[model samples]
Target: MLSKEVVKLLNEQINKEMYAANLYLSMSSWCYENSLDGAGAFLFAHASEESDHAKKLITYLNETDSHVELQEVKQPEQNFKSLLDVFEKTYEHEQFITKSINTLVEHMLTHKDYSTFNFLQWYVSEQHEEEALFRGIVDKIKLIGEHGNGLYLADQYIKNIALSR
Candidate 1:
């Protein structure tokens, strides 16, 4: 029961999530190739997480009696300089997603779309958690500094944090 504009937003988020997953996966590969196996594992996990978000949105839209669009998910950046670079970009992407979600909330204010609003509450909170986690990661990486074995140690730390379930 979503309006066309709302549906467009939903599909856009789907592709964004899909693109994020690919980005993380590519990041994971780059880490592994550089012998940063722990970082590889951590990023691989997030890739899976982002894909689930996309799938969750798709199922919800379908449940709402909407024909969802499958837009082309563009390629994500594969090259990164270091662990700091990777986490910084991850945090930046999360902030971008937060902005996108905020825009949808603004849309709700004008359209009075309560059903989508209610559904978006979880996503809003998820974005909150997502931003916090990445910001924490970015801060820690910056604190750790990007030089020598500290990078290796940071990779190990991230692998430990990855299983913080």
Candidate 2:
């Protein structure tokens, strides 16, 4: 059985993950509406992946006989100044998530919840990958800038990335 603290935090994480999915979907909509189909496609995939992460947590909670709360998720901003803004926001969000995951790991260690800690190791690795991916995208956007055909090339680059995944 999981402790109340772990259960509560896990439930909060579920909400956070759901919010992330919504945020990515909103970003995707903005991208599509602005005619950045490549970025839109990538955001859509990311939204789906976030949804999967939430579901994975839900399943784990159920299997452990813990209560899983589905809280209200806040709506994300649907407007972005540019593709660069969208990616910058995404990278910032990932950084926040990485910190939150680290906090959870610390809590698990303090509470001596070895099983949950072991389970969270997956998320630790996942956050590392997520941070790297978003950081790379942000860096690529920075390198491409917004001059001449740079935006167009960036879009195509994101499309190629989406296609590869």
Candidate 3:
């Protein structure tokens, strides 16, 4: 059985993950509405991945006989000034998520919740990859300014990358 504090923390993480999925979904819709099809597809995929992450947490909680409480997810921003702005926000959000995961790991360690800590290892690795990927996008966007055909090129690049994945 999991400790109350651990279960509470995990449930909070589940809510955060679901909120992330919703946020990505909102971003995807904005991209599609703005005719940024490539970025839209990428964001859609990311939203699905976040949902899967939430489900994994839920399943783990269930198997461990912990109380699972689903919280109301807050709405994400629905508008963007530009594709560059969207990606910048994405990178920032990933950083926030990394911090959250790190805090959870720290809590688990302090509590000596080794089982939870081991289970969270996947999330630790995932956050590392996610932070890298988002940071790379931000860097790429910086390299390709929002002038002339830069947006188009970036769109194509993102689309191709998303399709490959």
Candidate 4:
């Protein structure tokens, strides 16, 4: 059983994950419309990943005797000037999410919420990978500049960046 405070926060995070998925889906649509097919594919995959993340949290909450109240997910901006812009936004978003998850970990530790801490171990590792990935994409973009062929090639490379269990 989770403490009230802990459950409250965890439920909120469930919503956060869903919002993240929603935002990534919007980004994917924008990328597809803009003809950045590779980027669009990457974002589409990411959106699915985020949805899985949310589902995981919801499962946890339900298993722990908590109600998962899903809030309305506001859409993210559906516009990007270029592939670089999408990569830049993705990097920044991952940083912010990393901080939020870290804060949650801190809270769990400080409160001696060991079970929750243990539960979040997956998220800890996930954030690490997420940050590295976004940063890597940003670095690649920086090195390649914004040339069409360069962007396409980078996109192909990134699209091949498959998920590992």
Collision count for each candidate, in order: 0, 0, 0, 0
Q: Write one digit per residue (lDDT tens) for candidate 2, span 42-81.
A: 9999999999999999999999999888999997897899
> Which residues of candidate 1, in runs, are more than 4 Å off?
none
- lDDT digits (tens) for residues 34-138 of candidate 3: 888999999999999999999999999999988999989997889899888898898888888889999999999998999889999999999898888888887
**lDDT, residue 80, model 3:** 91
CA RMSD of each candidate after superposition: 1.2, 0.6, 0.8, 1.8
| lDDT of all predictions | 0.88, 0.93, 0.90, 0.83
- Candidate 1 lDDT: 0.88
TM-score of each: 0.95, 0.98, 0.98, 0.92
lDDT of 2 at 86: 98
| Model 3 residue 155 lDDT score | 83
Question: Using lDDT as the measure, which candidate wins?
Answer: 2
Instruction: Pick the winner on lDDT between candidates 2 and 3.
Output: 2
Candidate 2 segments whose C-alpha is farther than 4 A from its true place: none
| Model 4: residues with Cα > 4 Å off, grouped in runs | 162-165
* Residue-level error in angstroms, candidate 4, position 34: 1.8
